[PDB]
Design a protein around this ligand. Sequence first.
Ligand SMILES: Cc1cc2nc3c(=O)[nH]c(=O)nc-3n(C[C@H](O)[C@H](O)[C@H](O)COP(=O)(O)OP(=O)(O)OC[C@H]3O[C@@H](n4cnc5c(N)ncnc54)[C@H](O)[C@@H]3O)c2cc1C
Ligand SMILES: Cc1cc2nc3c(=O)[nH]c(=O)nc-3n(C[C@H](O)[C@H](O)[C@H](O)COP(=O)(O)OP(=O)(O)OC[C@H]3O[C@@H](n4cnc5c(N)ncnc54)[C@H](O)[C@@H]3O)c2cc1C
Ligand SMILES: Cc1cc2nc3c(=O)[nH]c(=O)nc-3n(C[C@H](O)[C@H](O)[C@H](O)COP(=O)(O)OP(=O)(O)OC[C@H]3O[C@@H](n4cnc5c(N)ncnc54)[C@H](O)[C@@H]3O)c2cc1C
Ligand SMILES: Cc1cc2nc3c(=O)[nH]c(=O)nc-3n(C[C@H](O)[C@H](O)[C@H](O)COP(=O)(O)OP(=O)(O)OC[C@H]3O[C@@H](n4cnc5c(N)ncnc54)[C@H](O)[C@@H]3O)c2cc1C
Ligand SMILES: CN1c2c(nc(N)[nH]c2=O)NC[C@@H]1CNc1ccc(C(=O)N[C@@H](CCC(=O)O)C(=O)O)cc1
Ligand SMILES: CN1c2c(nc(N)[nH]c2=O)NC[C@@H]1CNc1ccc(C(=O)N[C@@H](CCC(=O)O)C(=O)O)cc1
Ligand SMILES: CN1c2c(nc(N)[nH]c2=O)NC[C@@H]1CNc1ccc(C(=O)N[C@@H](CCC(=O)O)C(=O)O)cc1
Ligand SMILES: OC[C@@H](O)[C@@H](O)CO
Lengths: 285, 285, 278, 266
Amino acid sequence: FFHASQRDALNQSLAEVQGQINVSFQFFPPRTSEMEQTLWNSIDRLSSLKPKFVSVTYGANSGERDRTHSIIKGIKDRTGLEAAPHLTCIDATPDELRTIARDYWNNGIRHIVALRGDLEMYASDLVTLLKEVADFDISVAAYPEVHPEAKSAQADLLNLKRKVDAGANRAITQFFFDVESYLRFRDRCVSAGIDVEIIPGILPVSNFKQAKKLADMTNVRIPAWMAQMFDGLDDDAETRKLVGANIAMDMVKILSREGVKDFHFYTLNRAEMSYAICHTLGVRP
Amino acid sequence: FFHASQRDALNQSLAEVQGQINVSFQFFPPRTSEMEQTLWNSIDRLSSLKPKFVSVTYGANSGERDRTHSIIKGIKDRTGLEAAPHLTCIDATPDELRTIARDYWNNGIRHIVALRGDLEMYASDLVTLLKEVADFDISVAAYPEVHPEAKSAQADLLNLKRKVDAGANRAITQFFFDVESYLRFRDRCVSAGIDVEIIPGILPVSNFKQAKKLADMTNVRIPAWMAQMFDGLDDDAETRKLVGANIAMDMVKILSREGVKDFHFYTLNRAEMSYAICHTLGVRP
Amino acid sequence: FFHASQRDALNQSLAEVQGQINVSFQFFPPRTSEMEQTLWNSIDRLSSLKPKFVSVTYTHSIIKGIKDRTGLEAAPHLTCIDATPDELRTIARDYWNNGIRHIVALRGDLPPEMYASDLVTLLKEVADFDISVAAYPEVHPEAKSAQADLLNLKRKVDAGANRAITQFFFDVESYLRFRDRCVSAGIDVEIIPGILPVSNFKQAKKLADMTNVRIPAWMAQMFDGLDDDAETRKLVGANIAMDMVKILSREGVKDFHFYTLNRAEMSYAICHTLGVRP
Amino acid sequence: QINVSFQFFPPRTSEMEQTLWNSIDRLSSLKPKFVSVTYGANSGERDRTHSIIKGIKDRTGLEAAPHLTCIDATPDELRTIARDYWNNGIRHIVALRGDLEMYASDLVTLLKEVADFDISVAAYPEVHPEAKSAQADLLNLKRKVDAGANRAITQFFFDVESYLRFRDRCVSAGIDVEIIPGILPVSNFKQAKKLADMTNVRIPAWMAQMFDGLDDDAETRKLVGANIAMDMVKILSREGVKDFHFYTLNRAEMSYAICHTLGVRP
Ligand SMILES: Cc1cc2nc3c(=O)[nH]c(=O)nc-3n(C[C@H](O)[C@H](O)[C@H](O)COP(=O)(O)OP(=O)(O)OC[C@H]3O[C@@H](n4cnc5c(N)ncnc54)[C@H](O)[C@@H]3O)c2cc1C
Ligand SMILES: Cc1cc2nc3c(=O)[nH]c(=O)nc-3n(C[C@H](O)[C@H](O)[C@H](O)COP(=O)(O)OP(=O)(O)OC[C@H]3O[C@@H](n4cnc5c(N)ncnc54)[C@H](O)[C@@H]3O)c2cc1C
Ligand SMILES: Cc1cc2nc3c(=O)[nH]c(=O)nc-3n(C[C@H](O)[C@H](O)[C@H](O)COP(=O)(O)OP(=O)(O)OC[C@H]3O[C@@H](n4cnc5c(N)ncnc54)[C@H](O)[C@@H]3O)c2cc1C
Ligand SMILES: Cc1cc2nc3c(=O)[nH]c(=O)nc-3n(C[C@H](O)[C@H](O)[C@H](O)COP(=O)(O)OP(=O)(O)OC[C@H]3O[C@@H](n4cnc5c(N)ncnc54)[C@H](O)[C@@H]3O)c2cc1C
Ligand SMILES: CN1c2c(nc(N)[nH]c2=O)NC[C@@H]1CNc1ccc(C(=O)N[C@@H](CCC(=O)O)C(=O)O)cc1
Ligand SMILES: CN1c2c(nc(N)[nH]c2=O)NC[C@@H]1CNc1ccc(C(=O)N[C@@H](CCC(=O)O)C(=O)O)cc1
Ligand SMILES: CN1c2c(nc(N)[nH]c2=O)NC[C@@H]1CNc1ccc(C(=O)N[C@@H](CCC(=O)O)C(=O)O)cc1
Ligand SMILES: OC[C@@H](O)[C@@H](O)CO
């Protein structure tokens, strides 16, 4: 019985991973007092897992940069964790960006997630600018399914290489649900001579309607079986959570077996799903 | 990438099962007003899935038979579903059992789950007795991992055959977590010439401490990876639920692929996990 | 990589059976002073594994010595090829009156009238003995047909045997198919595999040929060229036996009977792999 | 159809010296494609490695490859050493960086400049402990192959899938040379566990459990270890592996028997 045997082997291998998996968590600036409370609850909960770092988004063109910086300082003060602000360049001048970068460095914030931003400079230009300011750890975005604006898959891949050559020392992927796409992309990164680990960004899905809208805008494929899995659950938050957890747990189990030892979670500021997924990877308090 | 491909295929096959899976749900008589409320909530919720039948346990030697009968009538009146009482013989005389059986039949209750009972007559004796009373549908217990009191695996298997030959038309298994054990047992049932479907009894685990105590008393193996999965979760009900759901969903996905189209859920009177597992099998309102 | 994953699952399942496997060990009466010492050493070494019982081929003395030395259930083998239906009742009653409640009832190899079924019936007429009888997955050489020999096993069980122990075999599929045919025939006792760990292939093959036990081509090839290499034979033979019991365990076998040939090393190691440890 | 090679180390005692030559005679009868001898900067030096290589060549006629490292050696020293080896009929070198400047790829390049050596290099299915990433380590192996290595020999492993997945990644990366599994037959688990822990080589739970309780039982360890190794090579062979490199630790019995099971016989 192949399928049963395969499952037992996959599960046992996952069990033996305990203590070898590095994780990171991504948060966004709360917009309500209710979300603020939720976030700090989640930060406390997830901090107990000793993530390698956490990060905080910055909405391009939002003009709310101060919120990002304030959350980052709060995290460092409260937890002692490495906290990395996201920084976009599409909405700031190089001079403004150098000032922002210098202030981060002087405030002990020395890992930046460097992005172009949701709509002059491209992300690689930001990477170069940041390294000129100081010796930052820099993480950049990777797209196993190709960024929607890329002229070609080759162009997008060479762009990642450009960002790495400019000084990026981590790549974090856009979320995906087609696991084969990530694995094929990881191999293509080797073919392009990219020597940094390609860290999968995991989106645990509880609100499928919303995840689908974003996937559709970002060129991320939702397999037919996954669409079928969430069909009929618009008003059943409980079942959606269980189904979503199952999907994410399956994904990390397979990725772990294929040698992935780094995961970045898009928490949407909630701890429950990411914490449980980490538990299955042997990442525990 | 074998593991990824295998998952996609398994998931898609599960998606195509929609509308082909029969399910049944097992409940027990509530002992508190709180549990009473929970049960009827669960009955309403699960009834919407159109189970082939539901059943209600009867604790052997408990002397609380009237509770079982009362719950069964309540279910039939409320839902129109086929509801099957469990009946044990270890604690009643044949005459008492015939009276009980006749009263059930005359009350429109014509499917009985016939058991010996947790500690004279063996279950096969009860099956014979029931068929003498009337043409009941009769379900009996099967043990993929061998009943703890059996002289041998062969003896236990021939006992199942005895119960089927006496008139049992369904076999429902003790819960298991070693899926290969069920599949091997299903094949052994064919070797013994048993022509009834062997319906897996599924226990969705949220309280592992308690499931383990019962498994240990019933000769049910808990794989090491499963013990590791629940390790450290004694005080984390949320994570236990997500982990447990993941395990049960994986099990039914594999069983479905191997051709199982009937599942019996040990609900412990709660709807959430069983309902979600059914959802993944395409059993939906 | 199905083969790799399958092996990992099989090995892990074996690791998890630890503490749930019943084992028994078979010994023979020593013919020399050297073998005498070897035997009691093996007994001391193997007793630490807490076997469900041990047996001695046919003897009465060894059985007694084992019982006193270790307190293990020691079952003498008894054949009806030697004595008369009356002497058997005398030798049997003599056992029960000493603490010997388990007997391996056999017809016996024939030297250069009644069958084992008759011996089981006889032994039981004396007392409520534990009776173990021989089963033959590949059919006893004298039997007229597979079904006839199978029905014979049924007779022996119906007569009072509560255990069947198999002739040794090397084709696991043969054992498994036979086990299935037994249940189909309504035989409700376990069919306990008799395992022969092979270190001397020339000798094992001689015996296999006389007993209708098949030696698979892969096994013949595995031992080819090792007539003068005792060390490699031991490693090859241990590997074969370990693989066999690993497969058998996954198929739900929880009882094993070891033909030790009075040596502890190989059986002790195989038991170790089954989680049967001091 | 199966090729084998055996790895030895320079004996540091009279007792081990006797054991090694016994093992060489035993294993040479299997006609390995080559044998190799390790180097320890503080456990024998280059002269001891070379002495054993010469002895093997003289005694058996087999191709014998020294493991040559580049730590604490200058490029001019390495060129002089390589020239000497080539002139002495040593035509296969296992080119390594070394257990603590140059990386192994630099040594491969240097050696190919000297002469058309057969060169074998180290590969790590579970990633070299110092690599900045699995991607970087794979790109390094490709650098070594592109510089002229015609063979990769893996660190030992006990998770067979790890080797299989690694081989697939090598092929995907366009690394076209054989990725030969290094096999460590285990008769002393305490010693093996130490070696594995230091190199990030996973020991499956079932394997640790298999050796539990055998600290003082050498005989059972041998039988259990032989079973593990025979099983591994059987699976690997089924998956198309036609070359095996045995970490003998100067003992012949286990490797010889494993080879027997692969059909490699005198
Ligand atoms: C992990 C992660 C975190 C993120 N965090 C944020 C956040 O905090 N705030 C936010 O607004 N967005 C965020 N994003 C989204 C991101 O900003 C968008 O996906 C944006 O469209 C691209 O950003 P980038 O850094 O990848 O840009 P780039 O790397 O510069 O690539 C963007 C597009 O430009 C193309 N391109 C690159 N160079 C050239 C060139 N020289 N000429 C022509 N085309 C070129 C690329 O191929 C690609 O199609 C995040 C995305 C990820 C994966
Ligand atoms: C789906 C399911 C629902 C259950 N519901 C209940 C419930 O509502 N109330 C309750 O108290 N328990 C219940 N049980 C538990 C059950 O009662 C116990 O497992 C009990 O120990 C065995 O019951 P049985 O009907 O299987 O008995 P049996 O089938 O009679 O078998 C019991 C044991 O007797 C052995 N045996 C059978 N015939 C003979 C013979 N002629 N001579 C010697 N040994 C023999 C069998 O091999 C076995 O070991 C349930 C179990 C399952 C799987
Ligand atoms: C675990 C084990 C332990 C053993 N220990 C010993 C020992 O200690 N001493 C020793 O000398 N030998 C021993 N033997 C070997 C055994 O004695 C021989 O195999 C002998 O040939 C058959 O013995 P049996 O008990 O199987 O008899 P049987 O069951 O009677 O079978 C012998 C043949 O007779 C046939 N047969 C049986 N009844 C009838 C009938 N009524 N009509 C027609 N045909 C019939 C059967 O099919 C079979 O072919 C042992 C064998 C095993 C597997
Ligand atoms: C089959 C085999 C036989 C061995 N025999 C011996 C022996 O006899 N004696 C001994 O002392 N050791 C021996 N070793 C071990 C070896 O020496 C160590 O593992 C050592 O740490 C690395 O050797 P290497 O040849 O693999 O080096 P490399 O291939 O150079 O790799 C070493 C590390 O450097 C990294 N790296 C490579 N290029 C760069 C770069 N440009 N910038 C940054 N990092 C880089 C690699 O990714 C890796 O992490 C052996 C190993 C194997 C697998
Ligand atoms: C920075 N993110 C991002 C990106 N890609 C692009 N182009 N832009 C981005 O901002 N990929 C990674 C990450 C994805 N972030 C997100 C943010 C919200 C939801 C979303 O579905 N939110 C729902 C429900 C949230 C919940 O379940 O709590 C919503 O209601 O908005 C999904 C992914
Ligand atoms: C009739 N049942 C049963 C059996 N087998 C035997 N021998 N006896 C039985 O009564 N197998 C099938 C079914 C199993 N029923 C059960 C009943 C309670 C729990 C248990 O774990 N209850 C926990 C928590 C319940 C919850 O999560 O809500 C408890 O606290 O008692 C598990 C299986
Ligand atoms: C009671 N036995 C038995 C039988 N089958 C028959 N027909 N007769 C029997 O006596 N099957 C089970 C068991 C088999 N016993 C044996 C006895 C010796 C050897 C054997 O080959 N021994 C070699 C060397 C022993 C050693 O390795 O130390 C020998 O010739 O002594 C194999 C199985
Ligand atoms: O002795 C085994 C050793 O050479 C390998 O682990 C590579 O370092």
